[PDB]
Design an enzyme around this catalytic site. Structure first.
Site, short mmCIF file in Angstrom:
data_model
loop_
_atom_site.label_atom_id
_atom_site.label_comp_id
_atom_site.label_asym_id
_atom_site.label_seq_id
_atom_site.Cartn_x
_atom_site.Cartn_y
_atom_site.Cartn_z
N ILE A 163 0.83 -1.21 0.00
CA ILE A 163 0.00 0.00 0.00
C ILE A 163 0.86 1.25 0.00
O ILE A 163 0.36 2.37 0.10
CB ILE A 163 -0.93 0.08 1.23
CG1 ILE A 163 -0.10 0.26 2.51
CG2 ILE A 163 -1.80 -1.16 1.31
CD1 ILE A 163 -0.94 0.54 3.73
N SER A 213 10.65 5.79 -0.08
CA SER A 213 12.11 5.66 -0.02
C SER A 213 12.70 4.79 1.10
O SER A 213 13.55 3.93 0.84
CB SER A 213 12.74 7.07 0.01
OG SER A 213 12.12 7.92 0.97
N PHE A 214 12.25 5.01 2.33
CA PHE A 214 12.72 4.25 3.49
C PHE A 214 12.51 2.73 3.38
O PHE A 214 13.39 1.95 3.75
CB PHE A 214 12.03 4.79 4.76
CG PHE A 214 12.68 6.02 5.32
CD1 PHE A 214 13.03 7.09 4.48
CD2 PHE A 214 12.97 6.12 6.68
CE1 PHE A 214 13.67 8.23 4.99
CE2 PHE A 214 13.61 7.26 7.20
CZ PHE A 214 13.95 8.31 6.35
N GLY A 215 11.34 2.33 2.87
CA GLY A 215 11.05 0.91 2.71
C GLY A 215 9.65 0.63 2.17
O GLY A 215 9.09 1.44 1.43
N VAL A 222 5.50 -0.44 2.90
CA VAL A 222 4.42 -0.34 3.88
C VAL A 222 3.27 -1.24 3.42
O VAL A 222 2.54 -0.89 2.49
CB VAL A 222 3.90 1.09 4.00
CG1 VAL A 222 2.71 1.14 4.93
CG2 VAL A 222 5.00 1.99 4.50
N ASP A 263 8.09 16.40 9.89
CA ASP A 263 7.49 16.14 8.58
C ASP A 263 5.97 16.16 8.66
O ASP A 263 5.30 15.24 8.16
CB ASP A 263 8.00 14.81 7.99
CG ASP A 263 7.71 14.70 6.46
OD1 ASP A 263 7.56 15.75 5.77
OD2 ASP A 263 7.66 13.55 5.96
O1 LIG Z 1 -2.87 3.25 8.42
C1 LIG Z 1 -2.66 3.61 7.28
C2 LIG Z 1 -1.26 3.43 6.72
C3 LIG Z 1 -0.64 4.61 5.98
C4 LIG Z 1 -1.38 5.49 5.09
N1 LIG Z 1 -0.44 6.49 4.86
C5 LIG Z 1 0.79 6.41 5.54
C6 LIG Z 1 1.99 7.19 5.65
C7 LIG Z 1 3.05 6.75 6.49
C8 LIG Z 1 2.94 5.50 7.24
N2 LIG Z 1 4.05 5.04 8.11
O2 LIG Z 1 3.97 4.02 8.73
O3 LIG Z 1 5.06 5.67 8.23
C9 LIG Z 1 1.75 4.71 7.15
C10 LIG Z 1 0.68 5.12 6.33
C11 LIG Z 1 -2.68 5.33 4.57
C12 LIG Z 1 -2.91 5.77 3.22
C13 LIG Z 1 -4.22 5.65 2.62
C14 LIG Z 1 -5.30 5.08 3.38
C15 LIG Z 1 -5.06 4.65 4.73
C16 LIG Z 1 -3.77 4.76 5.34
N3 LIG Z 1 -3.64 4.18 6.52
#
Ligand SMILES: O=C1Cc2c([nH]c3ccc([N+](=O)[O-])cc23)-c2ccccc2N1
Ligand SMILES: O=C1Cc2c([nH]c3ccc([N+](=O)[O-])cc23)-c2ccccc2N1
Lengths: 344, 341
Positions: A28, A32-34, A36, A143
């Site tokens: 999903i 850059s870091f990895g 998710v 950030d």
């Molecule tokens: O819990 C999450 C994970 C997640 C979303 N964006 C992120 C940005 C950073 C990180 N992270 O773990 O650093 C997780 C997420 C994201 C995007 C679209 C819909 C739901 C959503 N939800």
């Protein structure tokens, strides 16, 4: 369907290894870091996100050590963390939240509408609470932007996420000025300051608030120069002294462009007032997260009868801890309204 | 329709104003500095772009001063300049109008799932390096090299560098702001906040444009400097402590990703070689604009029989001046091919 079982360390409790099983894994994100991923915990069936990062044998992972000491209703929760290989990878198992302020705002924006102010109030207030909490430990997110603000559509609960840039700021110690995303960078970062404080998060939050009110980013630009021009158009030219406070050792001078001229008519004066107190050149002049929470713009959230448009009650907003209030305890007299104090 | 007559000063030569009339005015852009209009000169019928910027009358406009001094086939020409008002005073730059930009041309190919034919990558990049060799010979750094500032004439394939609103003469020992230059095209030393950078930042920017035309997308994207550096490290590898020192001012330790693995198969080895010599951590290690022009990747442009896909001859590519070659005269033996009159 495939089921993966690992043995992980609890995110916050005592070090008691737990056997965790998850299925329906799917990507999903590719930051850059990895990687998710999203996964489904077999048992409870709850969704989780797994941030997989390459773990340098050189030092301890900073994001992990920071996540392990955080426990707040407005910060995404680290459930478990374990290592794997597939090469050494650190995996962070976090609560999955369905939406983001970025996506919600974009939906309204291309429908030519703005997010109802009640939601701007709820979201911003929760963001300021999360900032008051991490800043009380001397931790700066670095950030703050719409994409790192997770939202549950039904409960209206907001959760700050992605601590991959977070760091404990120590007075006298230098910090890189190339953190923080484009439109949300405080002027001192644009000027290359290396001695900035946690107030950069406050400037970023101010940009998010202005953006939700406007329907688009308030200080866009592909170069720092362009961003500064947009900042000057609104705040006016910085005095030589304000430039000194931003720190870093020649723009067409413009005067104080009313903030009332900035937003559409109808915009609550209190919203405009709050933006002006957040988006200040001098970092020490900006409100602190806690002072922001106590601002009159959020008075409606403190009304005993307030309800979400969908009829449900608002989420928890007054369960402040001593840790949270430490920067200024007296504010509790405003932060915790009378009805939240009835013993019953 | 409406006709506007002003008394304007020729961009080059003696400061002697003349009456200039133009028609068919229309907005065609909105930049941070000011609006950009298109118009038609009543005499010649030629099309021109007019950039209007608010003028702090107590000081001389730097962009104007740099432009009055430039005269090159690969740099947009300042035809006239004049003042007008709206008690606020505006400086109006009357520049030659060019129909396209590398940004728009590249986007067209990109969303059609194709890449720009290499003959065009060669022509465009070579002309950009000529323009850089020229401005750098005067110690002038553009500081905002990007696809949007590269104008193109579709039929002749002539490229012209434009927008000198960030340009500045760089003087050794003098500090310069590190917040110039657009996102994807910023040299690592700027990301790190260096204040003593040189004209070689334009070379890094040009290298990013070359890689982008070959790839079909930006090579070092990212919304924060941190993200940009990660993309740079994925390709160049981790900077040695020394290279970081040359850039001046806590990252993972990834090793150099073979450049050949970066572009699609078929990509000319010379193109890849050129990118690697442009996108170097150490600023003094990057090729100079003139050395870039002489690179083997551009040999096809020096072939006597080369032609544009549309059948026309290539534009002027060898009319070098002494000024242009000053950084390294001997290169002329390569730059000006035998057949070139
Ligand atoms: O819990 C999450 C994970 C997640 C979303 N964006 C992120 C940005 C950073 C990180 N992270 O773990 O650093 C997780 C997420 C994201 C995007 C679209 C819909 C739901 C959503 N939800
Ligand atoms: O000559 C121009 C003016 C112009 C274009 N882009 C620009 C960027 C900067 C400046 N400038 O004067 O700084 C002018 C221009 C532009 C865009 C689309 C199509 C044609 C084109 N042509």
């Amino acid at each position: 369907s495939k089921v993966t079982t690992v043995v992980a360390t609890p995110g916050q409790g005592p070090d008691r290894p737990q056997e965790v099983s998850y299925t329906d894994t799917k990507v999903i994100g590719n930051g850059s870091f990895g990687v998710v991923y999203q996964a489904k915990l077999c048992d409870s069936g709850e969704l989780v996100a797994i941030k997989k990062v390459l773990q340098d044998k050189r030092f301890k992972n900073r994001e992990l050590q920071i996540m392990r000491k955080l426990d707040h209703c407005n910060i995404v929760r680290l459930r478990y963390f374990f290592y794997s290989s597939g090469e050494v990878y650190l995996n962070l198992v976090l609560d999955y939240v369905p939406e983001t302020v970025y996506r919600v705002a974009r939906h309204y924006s291309r429908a030519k509408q703005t997010l109802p102010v009640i939601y701007v109030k709820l979201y911003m207030y929760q963001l300021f609470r999360s900032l008051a909490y991490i800043h009380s430990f001397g931790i700066c997110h670095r950030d703050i932007k719409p994409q790192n603000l997770l939202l549950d559509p039904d409960t209206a609960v907001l959760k700050l996420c992605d601590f991959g840039s977070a760091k404990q700021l120590v007075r006298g110690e230098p910090n890189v000025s190339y953190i923080c995303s484009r439109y949300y960078r405080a002027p001192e970062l644009i000027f290359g300051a290396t001695d900035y404080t946690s107030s950069i998060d406050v400037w970023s939050a101010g940009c998010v608030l202005a953006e939700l009110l406007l329907g688009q980013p308030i200080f866009p630009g592909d170069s720092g120069v362009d961003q500064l021009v947009e900042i000057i158009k609104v705040l006016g030219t910085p005095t030589r002294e304000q430039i000194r406070e931003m720190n870093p050792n020649k723009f067409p001078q413009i005067k104080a462009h009313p903030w009332t001229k900035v937003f559409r008519p109808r915009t609550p004066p209190e919203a405009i007032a709050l933006c002006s107190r957040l988006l200040e050149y001098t970092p020490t002049a900006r409100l602190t997260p806690l002072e922001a929470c106590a601002h009159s713009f959020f008075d409606e959230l403190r009304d005993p009868n307030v309800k979400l448009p969908n009829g449900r009650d608002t989420p928890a907003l007054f369960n402040f801890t001593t840790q949270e209030l430490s920067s200024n305890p007296p504010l509790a007299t405003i932060l915790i309204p009378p009805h939240a104090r009835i013993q019953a």
